[PDB]
Amino acid sequence: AKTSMVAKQQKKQKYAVREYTRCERCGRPHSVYRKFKLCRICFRELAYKGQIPGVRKASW
């Protein structure tokens, strides 16, 4: 289950890195970028909303 892992990745840790960087809203840890800390699908979808500075056009 995901609910308690929100606390798990929030609480202090015994040592330096027992952590993983997941998205704040989406609970999916996989396929996330440290520049934004949003997951794959959420950041793709918010790109279409025209909220995050930058572009999605590609073709480059």
């Binding site: 794959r40 699908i41 790109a47 930058g54 572009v55 590609a58 073709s59």
Partner: protein, 102 residues
Amino acid sequence: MAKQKIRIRLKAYDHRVIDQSAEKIVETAKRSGADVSGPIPLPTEKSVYTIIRAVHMYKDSREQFEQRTHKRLIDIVNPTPKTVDALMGLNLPSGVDIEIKL
């Protein structure tokens, strides 16, 4: 090269907004002074982020993004508290990334 100078660096994500801001700043700089350096372009670094058009499988249908980043350089010689105000007074619109230096 040694000389009196004021140098600034400009950053924004729209070529029109950045070049119009550079134009207005050049106007104000030569207004309260002279011998100003023009809006020298810069290789305008880009970005890229590969992401799959998908929810659960099918990495084959990938799709791409970028974050283009215009960068601008302007230099000013023979400073005065007038060019200081001409720099730190008007930067609008506030999508541009200004950092005043010397």
